[PDB]
Description:
Blueprint (H helix, E strand, L loop, with lengths): L2 E10 L6 E5 L8 E4 L3 E11 L2 E6 L5 H5 L5 E5 L13 H4 L3 E4 L2 E12 L2 E8 L10 E4 L5 E3 L4 E3 L8
Parallel strand pairs: 7-12
Antiparallel strand pairs: 1-2, 1-6, 2-5, 3-4, 3-6, 4-5, 7-8, 8-9, 9-10, 11-12
Family: Belongs to the RimM family.
Subunit structure: Binds ribosomal protein uS19.
InterPro entries: PRC-brl_dom, PRC_barrel-like_sf, RimM, RimM_N, RimM_N_sf, Transl_B-barrel_sf
Amino acid sequence: MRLVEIGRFGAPYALKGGLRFRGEPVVLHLERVYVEGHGWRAIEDLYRVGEELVVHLAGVTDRTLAEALVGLRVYAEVADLPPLEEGRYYYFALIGLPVYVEGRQVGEVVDILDAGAQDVLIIRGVGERLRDRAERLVPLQAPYVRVEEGSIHVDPIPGLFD
């Protein structure tokens, strides 16, 4: 199993326990989500209203139960996500993956950034110079980069991870 953050609940919507959901539209394809500090909750219903998305969780049947979950992070089990085509990735799911070079862990993905024509992994990890440690950048789609289910492997390019 592996949980990845897909969003956070906003304020309750209407009176039956529905909650605004702020985060990934992929939630529309799920049947359950793990709620921070509370455990799995089956999704009983969800829908769009204008540009918002509202989720109804099993057992969250009024505003009082809903308020207890406002602001909490929401997670998906990776195995639950619709499979993507080759060469495509769920960015939110890459966050937190350990990054290795020749089998030695050199850091972990903390975010993904845009550098015009390519998506770039932001990695926190090693470095001879302190300022290079927290913002090391590696192009996600580079041929010297290999994304696997639970880790990312990068070739020992000279001057990449110094």
